[PDB]
Design an enzyme around this catalytic site. Sequence first.
Site, PDB file in Angstrom:
ATOM      1  N   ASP A  49       0.848  -1.191   0.000  1.00 48.37           N
ATOM      2  CA  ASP A  49       0.000   0.000   0.000  1.00 48.37           C
ATOM      3  C   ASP A  49       0.879   1.235   0.000  1.00 48.37           C
ATOM      4  O   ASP A  49       2.101   1.138   0.041  1.00 48.37           O
ATOM      5  CB  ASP A  49      -0.894   0.061   1.244  1.00 48.37           C
ATOM      6  CG  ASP A  49      -1.728  -1.189   1.454  1.00 48.37           C
ATOM      7  OD1 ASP A  49      -2.983  -1.092   1.356  1.00 48.37           O
ATOM      8  OD2 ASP A  49      -1.130  -2.252   1.752  1.00 48.37           O
ATOM      9  N   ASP A 107      -4.649   0.180   7.224  1.00 52.87           N
ATOM     10  CA  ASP A 107      -5.823  -0.651   7.069  1.00 52.87           C
ATOM     11  C   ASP A 107      -5.679  -1.574   5.846  1.00 52.87           C
ATOM     12  O   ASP A 107      -6.468  -1.508   4.913  1.00 52.87           O
ATOM     13  CB  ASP A 107      -7.080   0.239   6.976  1.00 52.87           C
ATOM     14  CG  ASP A 107      -7.117   1.109   5.712  1.00 52.87           C
ATOM     15  OD1 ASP A 107      -8.238   1.325   5.196  1.00 52.87           O
ATOM     16  OD2 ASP A 107      -6.050   1.551   5.218  1.00 52.87           O
ATOM     17  N   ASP A 156      -6.327  -4.026   3.266  1.00 55.54           N
ATOM     18  CA  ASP A 156      -7.487  -4.782   2.778  1.00 55.54           C
ATOM     19  C   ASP A 156      -7.034  -6.081   2.134  1.00 55.54           C
ATOM     20  O   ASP A 156      -7.764  -7.068   2.104  1.00 55.54           O
ATOM     21  CB  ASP A 156      -8.244  -3.980   1.700  1.00 55.54           C
ATOM     22  CG  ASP A 156      -9.598  -3.468   2.173  1.00 55.54           C
ATOM     23  OD1 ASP A 156      -9.770  -2.221   2.201  1.00 55.54           O
ATOM     24  OD2 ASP A 156     -10.490  -4.300   2.480  1.00 55.54           O
ATOM     25  N   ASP A 157      -5.833  -6.051   1.576  1.00 60.66           N
ATOM     26  CA  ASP A 157      -5.437  -7.076   0.652  1.00 60.66           C
ATOM     27  C   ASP A 157      -3.967  -7.415   0.751  1.00 60.66           C
ATOM     28  O   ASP A 157      -3.118  -6.635   1.180  1.00 60.66           O
ATOM     29  CB  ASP A 157      -5.800  -6.694  -0.798  1.00 60.66           C
ATOM     30  CG  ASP A 157      -5.118  -5.410  -1.254  1.00 60.66           C
ATOM     31  OD1 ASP A 157      -5.493  -4.328  -0.742  1.00 60.66           O
ATOM     32  OD2 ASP A 157      -4.215  -5.480  -2.115  1.00 60.66           O
ATOM     33  N   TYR A 208       4.461   1.316  -1.848  1.00 59.19           N
ATOM     34  CA  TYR A 208       4.540   1.382  -3.322  1.00 59.19           C
ATOM     35  C   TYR A 208       5.838   1.942  -3.876  1.00 59.19           C
ATOM     36  O   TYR A 208       6.539   1.267  -4.628  1.00 59.19           O
ATOM     37  CB  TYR A 208       3.406   2.248  -3.884  1.00 59.19           C
ATOM     38  CG  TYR A 208       2.037   1.612  -3.905  1.00 59.19           C
ATOM     39  CD1 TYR A 208       1.765   0.432  -4.610  1.00 59.19           C
ATOM     40  CD2 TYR A 208       0.957   2.189  -3.276  1.00 59.19           C
ATOM     41  CE1 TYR A 208       0.427  -0.101  -4.615  1.00 59.19           C
ATOM     42  CE2 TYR A 208      -0.330   1.758  -3.224  1.00 59.19           C
ATOM     43  CZ  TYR A 208      -0.616   0.576  -3.923  1.00 59.19           C
ATOM     44  OH  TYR A 208      -1.906   0.087  -3.922  1.00 59.19           O
ATOM     45  N   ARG A 265     -14.361  -1.069   2.535  1.00 60.11           N
ATOM     46  CA  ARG A 265     -14.677   0.206   1.889  1.00 60.11           C
ATOM     47  C   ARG A 265     -15.926   0.114   0.974  1.00 60.11           C
ATOM     48  O   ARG A 265     -16.405   1.137   0.488  1.00 60.11           O
ATOM     49  CB  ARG A 265     -13.476   0.674   1.050  1.00 60.11           C
ATOM     50  CG  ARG A 265     -12.160   0.684   1.798  1.00 60.11           C
ATOM     51  CD  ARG A 265     -11.012   1.009   0.861  1.00 60.11           C
ATOM     52  NE  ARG A 265      -9.848   1.484   1.610  1.00 60.11           N
ATOM     53  CZ  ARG A 265      -8.667   1.793   1.079  1.00 60.11           C
ATOM     54  NH1 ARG A 265      -8.461   1.679  -0.227  1.00 60.11           N
ATOM     55  NH2 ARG A 265      -7.686   2.217   1.866  1.00 60.11           N
TER      56      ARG A 265
HETATM   57 MG   LIG Z   1      -4.227  -2.691   0.096  1.00 58.59          MG
END
Ligand SMILES: [Mg+2]
EC number: 3.1.13.1
Length: 637
Positions: free
Chosen positions: A194, A200, A202-203, A306, A493
């Site tokens: 991220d 947070d 998510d993935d 990133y 989200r």
């Molecule tokens: Mg993510």
Amino acid sequence: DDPLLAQLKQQLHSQTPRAEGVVKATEFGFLEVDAQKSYFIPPPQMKKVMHGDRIIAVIHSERESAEPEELVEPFLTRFVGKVQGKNDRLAIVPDHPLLKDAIPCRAARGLNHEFKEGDWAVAEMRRHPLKGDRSFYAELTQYITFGDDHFVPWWVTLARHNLEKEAPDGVATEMLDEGLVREDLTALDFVTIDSASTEDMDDALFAKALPDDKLQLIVAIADPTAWIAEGSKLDKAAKIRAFTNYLPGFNIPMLPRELSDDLCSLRANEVRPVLACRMTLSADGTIEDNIEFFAATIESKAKLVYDQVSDWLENTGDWQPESEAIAEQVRLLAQICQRRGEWRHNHALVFKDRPDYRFILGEKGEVLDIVAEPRRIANRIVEEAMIAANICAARVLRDKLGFGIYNVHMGFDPANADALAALLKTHGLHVDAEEVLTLDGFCKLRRELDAQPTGFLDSRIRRFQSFAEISTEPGPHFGLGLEAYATWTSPIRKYGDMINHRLLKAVIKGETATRPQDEITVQMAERRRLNRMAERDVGDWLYARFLKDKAGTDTRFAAEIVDISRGGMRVRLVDNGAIAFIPAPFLHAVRDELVCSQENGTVQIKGETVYKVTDVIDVTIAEVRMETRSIIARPVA
Ligand SMILES: [Mg+2]
Ligand SMILES: Nc1ccn([C@@H]2O[C@H](COP(=O)(O)O)[C@@H](O)[C@H]2O)c(=O)n1
Ligand SMILES: [Ca+2]
């Protein structure tokens, strides 16, 4: 009147010449009945009406004029505005740029609040002269904030769309027993990727090389529905909201923070439940039929960022992976990204890079700068994985269910295909009227339209473009160039993604599942539309703040012409994304030598094209009117 005389006067009244139309104001106005018919409304007749009211009027002659008689539909209902002249008489000017008059008002009962000059309120119209009332009148229903609050932008915008300003209320967690069988993924080297700030996750990613030049991807997605039961308070709260509302400098989450930030988040070196998808990719990039959804638990190995990942991969910057294990995960993942990019290239459509502008704000919500964050491999690595994962869910829900929360794009509507092909011909592009209605032909048009040296011809067919939908029915996505399309990768989200999570969980267990109600996707579409408006209204306020001090200076900005109309050109500043307007008189001295054609996308002076939609030009900032947030630009030289 007198029963005979009354019947007579009635019948006479009933045959009085009439017209129906929309009120347009300025200095007197007009009753706009259609494209080539309008009636003059004298200013005394003006008084009965608001700009934009749909009405019936008496037509009068002896010069013809319209005398308003009946309200068909008022322009103004619920609205926002600034209050004036206090409780010794309150009035409210709607924030509506075309509504300039104060409307007498008063506070609703129970509205504790003592209103003063400048105060922002939500209001409801209650009286209208055409409903027989002596005056226009409104009730103030909500106190917004005070007139010189720096945070105006945010509070007024949330209020105007009646959107919530707060996260939902947290509820005592305990993880739910859905009788899932959770594979223990914990040994595996999952990594999250991220931006810097994000807490947070998510993935979650894991790659593995296979025989026959194959690649295995596992996408592990956070697990909210393992806590939030279908039908719970958080449930019905999340469903109303539909989406986290992302605003410049400020989001309103769909779910409580403790859940998002902590319990669900795929934090490094912590054990988390997940919904997982293991897919196998061909050397082609093709997602093989091998698709396995299952519940699991992972332990993220590396909270990656990133830019750092993009740097390491281009052998630039300082940052290395903490171990060989992580390096290899990154390398494998970049390889996956490359094959998928290629695949979508060849077999679907890859959207052309659109600068994403971020406002950099200070403490009083001032604009420091607005920066276009550009996209690099690490960003694409994630995107390609998320897209493949979402394609996977679409196929399996289509297969095993027949339904899901799908993202839907029908292409050009059949009733517009001929007009389409004809317009392209006039511009010298061959396409077929019935091939363009097939996924394949839609993609071929899009492809060569994006090999265009400019966006002009593109621009010419905006008017024919369909928009993205929300459906429970599996269906093609023409925009993405895909047979199917449903998202489950950001359920914290998106309510739709939570629904799909529960559907996928039924499939995994061999359970039966209920199709979501169509009112479902309707409310979802409404909140999306809301959130988008909320973000652009924020942005608009922000852009005005940012550009105010450039007003009347010779600061230049390159700008792309986005629209051309009668009254001038709308223009987007290339380096910050601000919207400005250039009035027609700024473009040429002699009105009658100037033609701004909406329909052509051109401005001509004395019959020669000077501007086109998609052209970039240099402008200065002539005016920033803070009242309306409008930016007025002038071409350089
Ligand atoms: Mg993510
Ligand atoms: N067709 C229209 C045109 C305008 N209006 C409303 O007029 C409102 C006036 O905006 P304010 O709330 O700033 O006054 C618009 O935001 C819009 O909701 C409408 O409700 N229907
Ligand atoms: Ca106004």
